[PDB]
Design an enzyme around this catalytic site. Structure first.
Site, short mmCIF file in Angstrom:
data_model
loop_
_atom_site.label_atom_id
_atom_site.label_comp_id
_atom_site.label_asym_id
_atom_site.label_seq_id
_atom_site.Cartn_x
_atom_site.Cartn_y
_atom_site.Cartn_z
N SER A 167 6.41 15.47 3.43
CA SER A 167 5.74 17.01 3.45
C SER A 167 4.78 16.78 4.84
O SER A 167 3.96 16.27 5.00
CB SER A 167 5.04 17.07 2.06
OG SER A 167 5.87 16.74 1.03
N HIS B 118 9.55 21.60 3.40
CA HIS B 118 10.63 20.74 3.63
C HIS B 118 11.97 21.63 4.00
O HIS B 118 12.46 22.44 3.16
CB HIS B 118 10.93 19.87 2.36
CG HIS B 118 10.12 18.66 2.11
ND1 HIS B 118 10.21 17.60 2.96
CD2 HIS B 118 9.15 18.40 1.30
CE1 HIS B 118 9.44 16.64 2.48
NE2 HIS B 118 8.71 17.15 1.63
N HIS C 138 12.86 15.24 -4.44
CA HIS C 138 11.97 14.66 -5.38
C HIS C 138 12.50 14.73 -6.88
O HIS C 138 12.92 15.47 -7.33
CB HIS C 138 10.39 15.10 -5.52
CG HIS C 138 10.10 15.25 -3.75
ND1 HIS C 138 10.24 16.27 -2.81
CD2 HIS C 138 9.11 14.21 -3.33
CE1 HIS C 138 9.49 15.98 -1.80
NE2 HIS C 138 8.99 14.94 -1.95
N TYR D 20 10.34 15.30 -9.33
CA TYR D 20 9.66 16.24 -9.88
C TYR D 20 10.59 17.45 -9.87
O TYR D 20 10.38 18.73 -10.62
CB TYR D 20 8.36 16.45 -9.50
CG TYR D 20 8.14 16.88 -7.99
CD1 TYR D 20 8.41 17.98 -7.63
CD2 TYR D 20 7.57 15.86 -7.23
CE1 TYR D 20 8.24 18.17 -6.30
CE2 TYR D 20 7.47 16.12 -5.83
CZ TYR D 20 7.83 17.25 -5.25
OH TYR D 20 7.31 17.54 -4.03
N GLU D 21 11.43 17.79 -8.99
CA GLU D 21 12.39 18.93 -8.93
C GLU D 21 13.41 19.05 -9.78
O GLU D 21 13.96 20.14 -10.12
CB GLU D 21 13.04 18.81 -7.39
CG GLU D 21 11.95 19.18 -6.18
CD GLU D 21 12.70 18.97 -4.87
OE1 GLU D 21 12.57 18.00 -4.24
OE2 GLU D 21 13.69 19.84 -4.39
N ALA E 14 3.39 12.23 3.15
CA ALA E 14 2.03 12.38 2.78
C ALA E 14 1.62 11.52 1.54
O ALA E 14 2.55 11.45 0.72
CB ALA E 14 1.83 13.81 2.81
N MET F 184 4.77 11.05 -4.56
CA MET F 184 5.74 11.36 -5.47
C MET F 184 6.89 10.98 -4.89
O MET F 184 8.04 11.48 -5.64
CB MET F 184 5.45 12.68 -6.28
CG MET F 184 4.14 13.11 -6.20
SD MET F 184 4.08 14.94 -6.67
CE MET F 184 2.27 15.14 -7.12
N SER F 185 7.18 10.02 -4.30
CA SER F 185 8.42 10.07 -3.49
C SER F 185 8.54 8.42 -2.92
O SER F 185 7.87 7.44 -3.34
CB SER F 185 8.66 10.85 -2.09
OG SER F 185 7.61 10.22 -1.01
N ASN G 185 -5.29 13.68 2.08
CA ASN G 185 -6.61 13.99 1.07
C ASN G 185 -7.06 12.96 0.57
O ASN G 185 -6.35 12.03 0.14
CB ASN G 185 -5.90 15.03 0.31
CG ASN G 185 -4.81 14.92 -0.57
OD1 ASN G 185 -4.00 14.49 -0.35
ND2 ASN G 185 -5.24 14.45 -1.93
N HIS H 139 -1.67 21.59 -2.28
CA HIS H 139 -0.45 21.49 -1.29
C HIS H 139 -0.92 22.23 -0.11
O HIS H 139 -0.48 21.50 1.08
CB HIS H 139 0.60 22.39 -1.93
CG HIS H 139 1.85 22.05 -1.15
ND1 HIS H 139 2.20 20.87 -0.91
CD2 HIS H 139 2.83 22.84 -0.61
CE1 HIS H 139 3.37 20.69 -0.14
NE2 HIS H 139 3.78 21.92 0.08
N1 LIG Z 1 0.53 12.36 -6.59
C1 LIG Z 1 -0.04 12.75 -5.27
N2 LIG Z 1 0.60 12.87 -4.28
C2 LIG Z 1 0.03 13.52 -3.05
C3 LIG Z 1 0.71 13.93 -1.68
C4 LIG Z 1 2.27 13.86 -1.42
N3 LIG Z 1 3.29 14.62 -1.84
C5 LIG Z 1 2.95 16.28 -1.28
C6 LIG Z 1 3.17 17.05 -2.21
C7 LIG Z 1 2.09 18.01 -2.81
O1 LIG Z 1 1.26 18.50 -1.61
C8 LIG Z 1 4.12 16.39 -3.29
O2 LIG Z 1 5.48 16.04 -2.98
C9 LIG Z 1 3.29 14.97 -3.26
C10 LIG Z 1 -0.22 14.16 -0.99
N4 LIG Z 1 -1.15 13.90 -1.53
C11 LIG Z 1 -1.22 13.55 -2.81
C12 LIG Z 1 -2.10 13.40 -4.15
O3 LIG Z 1 -3.18 13.44 -3.94
N5 LIG Z 1 -1.42 12.92 -5.35
#
Ligand SMILES: Nc1nc2c(CN3C[C@H](CO)[C@@H](O)C3)c[nH]c2c(=O)[nH]1
Ligand SMILES: Nc1nc2c(CN3C[C@H](CO)[C@@H](O)C3)c[nH]c2c(=O)[nH]1
Ligand SMILES: Nc1nc2c(CN3C[C@H](CO)[C@@H](O)C3)c[nH]c2c(=O)[nH]1
Lengths: 286, 288, 287
Positions: free
Chosen positions: C34, C65, C87, C89-90, C117, C220-221, C244, C258
């Site tokens: 991402s 994406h 993903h 979650y999708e 990320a 998440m990937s 972050n 995001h």
């Molecule tokens: N679980 C989680 N995933 C991420 C991600 C990675 N992805 C970035 C996107 C949300 O910004 C999702 O696909 C998860 C970045 N930061 C974080 C976080 O603090 N937590």
């Protein structure tokens, strides 16, 4: 969603088995990976392939034969699963645990669960037998519990307790008897953690499971135990420690199925002698 | 192939409009009653009852200890709608069915969701009958995929990636604590982390110790999915658990967790729950 | 029976289609995370395929994406790059999420580079850090969500593949020793990635769980792709951009979001491209 089997399906399978054998088992034994040789010591053995039996799940796995064996083990009426079903194969848990309810309907009062397992407790050696005092059901925490869906009241309660799942008295008797085996290694006791697999653990994952207080890890057993306890069966469990789970990044060793089967075959004689002593510690019906 | 929500936006809207056209009540607060906590609907004045079977698109229940009805009314002078009987993942419902009513409440014009449950005590200082304010949760099913927001995001409800670090309203919890301290009651109002596990079987001793090690103070099989969906659509959220039993944490004990004891603890704490819900209504901000 | 919906022939048809529509023959596959889609910019002799063109490829919409496969050369090395991953979650099952990894195997790729990320759990990580993935914790996998669930296809790999050596030791050592050439103030981080399903961000209590479990970053990937890659014999290298710091106390008013994740990606894009360039030089040749 829900269990695809009705109460009548379990009953039809049990009645079919009862009308095709004179054997009336008190104890059901589920044989784990590389532990199929436990059926060799059965006297007056009668074999049913899973394909013969109505409503029974049908596929394979190498290391697991696919047959139900009725017979006597040290004079005790047993039925033995040579080949269990696993969630990683694609079966839902209500298929995985189907035979446990069949055994209940055959009149079995005690389920003995056996498995191969990876050692997480560093004091365990390959070839150790670990009595299962307790389990950690990681798939269950997330939703993968064999009782998910409508509860069938004719088997048990909606919310069964699991804190007393592994019979206290049988474990005490198995420990005190183990003197009779004449072994160098003492009988181990600990917590089995179920993970779905089918891939083996990473080092970080191994350390998670150690931190959670698990002593051995595998991909089976826990769903059967839950269904057994749901319908009132006494439960005894043990693991053969077939490999030590990799817990550092320096090691070049890797978990593998061939080593697991080999550990099983090397311990086969000792497992048969232990299961023999185990039958003597099992209470009679009524 | 694609695992998604079976309800459209129109389904939620049809259900809300149906309810709005069949009652004069206009609730600000939605309250979900947990196992053995259905008696919380008794103090409602000007009550109007809808069975879930009457309501379009509503799931049809099957648990004893949970009635299966939506009750509109006034609780301590505040316009409420109350779920007597929630839905659980262990029953076989997917989480998008479990959490369906939360989005309906949003469309009715509710701005605050109060989630209640029975829970097993993991923190050893908790006693049976304690009320624990839910400061936070651990969503174990969510880690593995079982999140009610799984599938395409509906932008009309909320964002694709909603934050949950501020899920349990800070101000309401502070007000509930300070108001309790002013009462001069001997036993304190507890505060802690709720962990959701799917069930339906109760925990082993080893599992209890896992949940303790993870930092959970109470355990149950509900609540977290509703909270996620509530926060996704902008609802203020307040949560509390009735500690109905102490989870078995040693192998010497002959005691076992059981539903009958859970229901009994609920009924015994009825008076204390009514006093607590009274203080709770006072701590909820009015609309703009 | 919960199983893979693709046959061996489906993977083969997709690979053969790609092979007959490009002259490129990639050795390395790179999955862009991402806000990391700009990694495809430095490709020379680039050829673009939208996912919609490609037979049997999953279709659909995430922002951040793009949805395209880019063949080309990166620092003189034959690459294929996924700009846009799938993903769980999708709503995709993991056998759809990981479909392209087996396609790459059949194209003749021997190395998978996974990027993402991630939220920082290790307090010493700062926003903008690159963390080499030494290991992972597969939380969905523990419960049943593993891309290998169902019948094993022997033509790809074994029934019970090991994952203790998933992240290639030699490539990580070489990436660390080379990082001297980048001339950066911040040292290259190394740690454990934990996968959680999402799509909602973590609570404080959940963040502390993941910290207690020994995870350094969360996302998440990535993990499903790595498992499928190792199952079919691919060498695997992974890194996370720390976008972050995960909220770990109740006093903070800050929230994961995001928009901040995408922004961190774009700010680090130049540094990621230079790092992936040095990375290609450390990848062994075929045979
Ligand atoms: N679980 C989680 N995933 C991420 C991600 C990675 N992805 C970035 C996107 C949300 O910004 C999702 O696909 C998860 C970045 N930061 C974080 C976080 O603090 N937590
Ligand atoms: N998860 C896990 N399971 C096992 C098992 C038990 N089963 C043995 C078989 C793999 O050889 C699978 O069905 C899992 C033995 N060793 C290990 C291990 O190290 N890890
Ligand atoms: N997991 C769990 N849940 C509960 C609950 C909450 N619910 C009460 C009901 C079973 O009595 C289920 O819906 C779970 C009370 N006590 C406990 C406990 O010890 N454990």
């Amino acid at each position: 969603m829900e269990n695809g089997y009705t109460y009548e399906d379990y009953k039809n399978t049990a009645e079919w088995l009862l009308s095709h054998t004179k054997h009336r088992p008190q104890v059901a034994i589920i044989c784990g990976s590389g532990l199929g040789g436990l059926t060799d010591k059965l006297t007056q053995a009668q074999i049913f392939d899973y394909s013969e039996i109505p409503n029974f799940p049908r596929s394979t796995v190498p290391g697991h034969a696919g047959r139900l064996v009725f017979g006597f083990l040290n004079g005790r009426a047993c039925v033995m699963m040579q080949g269990r079903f696993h969630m990683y194969e694609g079966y839902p848990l209500w298929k995985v645990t189907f035979p446990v309810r069949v055994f209940h309907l055959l009149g079995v009062d005690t389920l003995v669960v056996t498995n191969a397992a990876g050692g997480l407790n560093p004091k365990f050696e390959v070839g150790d037998i670990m009595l299962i005092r307790d389990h950690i059901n990681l798939p269950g925490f997330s939703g993968q519990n064999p009782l998910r869906g409508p509860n069938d009241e004719r088997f048990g309660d909606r919310y069964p307790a699991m804190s007393d799942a592994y019979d206290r008295t049988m474990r005490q008797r198995a420990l005190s008897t183990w003197k009779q085996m004449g072994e160098q290694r003492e009988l181990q006791e600990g917590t089995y953690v179920m993970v779905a697999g089918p891939s083996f653990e990473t080092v970080a994952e191994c350390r998670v499971l150690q931190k959670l207080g698990a002593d051995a890890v595998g991909m089976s057993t826990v769903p059967e135990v839950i269904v057994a306890r749901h319908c009132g069966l006494r439960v005894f469990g043990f693991s053969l420690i077939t490999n030590k789970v990799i817990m550092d990044y320096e090691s070049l060793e890797k978990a593998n199925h061939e080593e697991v089967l080999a550990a099983g075959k090397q311990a086969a004689q000792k497992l048969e002698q232990f299961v023999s002593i185990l039958m003597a510690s099992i209470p009679l019906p009524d």
